[PDB]
Amino acid sequence: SVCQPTRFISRHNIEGIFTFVDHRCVATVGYQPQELLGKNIVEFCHPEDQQLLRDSFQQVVKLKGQVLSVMFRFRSKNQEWLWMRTSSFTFQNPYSDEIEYIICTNTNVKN
C-alpha cells in the first residue's frame, strides 16, 4: 500500500570517497557496491553539480553532526543521470578522536 522511495545508505571520508555502500545501491543507481567502494562520489556527479557536491562535503563537516541535504544528478550504471537527494551528517564515536566520517542517505527523487 506504501510505495517507498528507492534509496541507499553510504559512508564517505571527508574527501568524498565511498568507504561503505549499502546493497540497495543496485536498485537505486544500478551499481554493485564493489563498483562504488574506493571511488569518489564526485566521479558519478553531473559536471554542473560537481562543485555544489564538493561544497556539501565541506559544509556538512562544519555542521558538526547536523544534517545537510543536497540535490544533484548521479550517473547510473545505464548512463541515465538520476536526480538524487542526499541527506548527510558527520559522525564521530564519542569514546575516541578518530576523524569524522560522513553518513549519506541517497534517494532517487523527482526534480
Binding site: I9, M71, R85, S87, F91, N93, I103, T105
Partner: protein, 106 residues
C-alpha cells in the same frame, strides 16, 4: 569501527535496513531483522527510556540514547548506545525514515 553497525528504520522503528556488521556483534543476519520492531530486542528495563528518547527524536531531529541492553541471537544481552537521525522528505519536510549509528560498549 569493529564495534559499530548502521541501521535504517521506518518511523515505527521497524528495521528497513541493517548493516552486515551486526552479525559479528550480535549474531543476527540482517534478513532476520527486516520488518521487525527493534523494541522486540530491547531489554524490558530499557524500553521506557528508549521510548522517551524516540519521542523527543522527532522534536529534536537527532538524539543519542545512552546505554541500553539489546538481546543478541545467542549469549544474552549486549550493551549498546545509538545515535538516531531523522531523515526528512524534501517536498513536505515530513519525516521519511530513521538512520541509526549503533555502537556496542559491552
Amino acid at each position: 569501527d569493529s564495534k559499530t553497525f548502521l541501521s535504517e528504520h521506518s518511523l515505527d522503528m521497524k528495521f528497513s535496513y541493517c548493516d552486515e556488521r551486526i552479525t559479528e556483534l550480535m549474531g543476527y543476519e540482517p534478513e532476520e531483522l527486516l520488518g521487525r520492531s527493534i523494541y522486540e530486542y530491547y531489554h524490558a528495563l530499557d524500553s521506557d527510556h528508549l521510548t522517551k528518547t524516540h519521542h523527543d527524536m522527532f522534536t529534536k531531529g537527532q538524539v543519542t540514547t545512552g546505554q541500553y541492553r539489546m538481546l543478541a541471537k545467542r549469549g544474552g544481552y549486549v550493551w549498546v548506545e545509538t545515535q538516531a537521525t531523522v531523515i526528512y522528505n524534501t517536498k513536505n519536510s515530513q519525516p521519511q525514515c530513521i538512520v541509526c549509528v549503533n555502537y556496542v560498549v559491552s
